[PDB]
């Protein structure tokens, strides 16, 4: 599924992501567009053996199971097929544990370098929410 | 399947450190996050912090810099310390996962001369 | 520092009866509020994950729903293995926080 803007900022919020542990919601759109485009079945496979996978790019050597990566850690306890869904439920619950690590956002590298210092609640402007 | 266990004294004199254990089995240590919660004695439940996979930790203000939370891989437990205690850190400790989904049984520590 | 206050402090049922508990959040905390059910002398125990999520090994008879500022649990038909305490939990912010608890008082 490919979110419009307006339709994904709407979505993260009713999932509870505005100014979750201190992120305000420009921040997690921001990032969803340039982690994915928007694109729920994003999929892209690393240099290292592991794949990152979904609208928020959630990397199989920590966070979900794939099988094919080599020290798979598993920390939201889900096989990364459920994350590449039209509904970003558990994306989203995954993405809470990741931001609750001292790393907090930087954790996505595309969010690191195209949003972070940026004005990220242009994300959110010109939509109703 | 995922067990918790506490351990550790059950009475500690004012200003002493109480320290306690939380033996995990079924599963590593590092596949979650862990946390320490405490019940005061009228049902007041209070979260005191959690370590995180990469090690970094999150400590209740409330606690005044007294705590310390650290984990041993090796021998999959992890760890409470909590410094210069008073009577008001009479409580039941419970060790549990981030989200609440595993908890041990509590144990009853009693500060007390 | 979010504050979450839960009313009534008591409530007392009848088996067989439906309730509602609520939890209400001193500031907005979007769906990050979860419940939770503590026995006498036992650990407390998940029911509801993030406002309305189900968990497996929950009785179906327990739903959460609410956002914001505002939140409930009913539980449909309580029954008697359902009288104890319950508690909400805010993860939106740390310190993480706890509401003073209901307690499910067989009537």
């Known amino acids: 599924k490919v979110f419009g803007r307006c339709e994904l900022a709407a979505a993260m919020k009713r999932h509870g992501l505005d100014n979750y542990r201190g992120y305000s919601l420009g921040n997690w759109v921001c990032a969803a567009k340039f982690e994915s485009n928007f694109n729920t079945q994003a999929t892209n496979r690393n240099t290292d053996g592991s794949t990152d996978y979904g609208i928020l790019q959630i990397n199989s050597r920590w966070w979900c199971n794939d099988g094919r990566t080599p020290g798979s850690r598993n920390l939201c306890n889900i096989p990364c097929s459920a994350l590449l869904s039209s509904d970003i439920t558990a994306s989203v619950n995954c993405a809470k544990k990741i931001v609750s690590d001292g790393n907090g956002m930087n954790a996505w590298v595309a969010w690191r370098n195209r949003c972070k210092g940026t004005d990220v609640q242009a994300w959110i402007r010109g939509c109703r929410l | 399947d995922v067990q918790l266990q506490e351990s550790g004294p059950s009475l500690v004199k004012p200003s002493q450190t109480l320290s306690l254990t939380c033996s995990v089995t079924?599963?590593?240590?590092?596949?979650?996050?862990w946390s320490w919660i405490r019940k005061f004695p009228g049902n007041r439940l209070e979260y005191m912090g959690y370590?995180?996979?990469?090690?970094?930790?999150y400590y209740n203000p409330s606690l005044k810099s007294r705590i310390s939370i650290t984990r041993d891989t090796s021998k999959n437990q992890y760890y409470l310390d909590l410094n210069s205690v008073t009577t008001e850190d009479t409580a039941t400790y419970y060790c549990?996962?981030?989200?609440?989904?595993?908890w041990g049984q509590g144990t009853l520590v009693t500060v007390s001369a | 520092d979010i504050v979450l206050t839960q009313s009534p402090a008591t409530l007392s049922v009848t088996p067989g009866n439906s309730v509602s508990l609520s939890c209400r959040a001193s500031?907005?905390?979007?769906?990050?509020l979860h419940w939770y059910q503590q026995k006498s002398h036992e650990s407390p125990r998940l029911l509801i994950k993030?406002?309305?999520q189900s968990i497996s090994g929950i009785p179906s008879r327990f739903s959460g729903s609410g956002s914001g500022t505002d939140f409930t649990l009913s539980i449909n038909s309580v029954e008697t293995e359902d009288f104890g305490m319950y508690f909400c939990?805010?993860?939106?912010?740390?310190?993480?926080?706890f509401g003073g608890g209901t307690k499910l008082e067989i009537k």
């Open positions: 549990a996962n981030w989200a609440g989904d595993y």
């Open positions: 079924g599963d590593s240590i590092t596949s979650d996050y």
């Open positions: 370590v995180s996979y990469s090690g970094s930790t």
């Open positions: 500031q907005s905390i979007g769906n990050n």
């Open positions: 993030y406002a309305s």
């Open positions: 939990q805010q993860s939106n912010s740390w310190p993480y926080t």
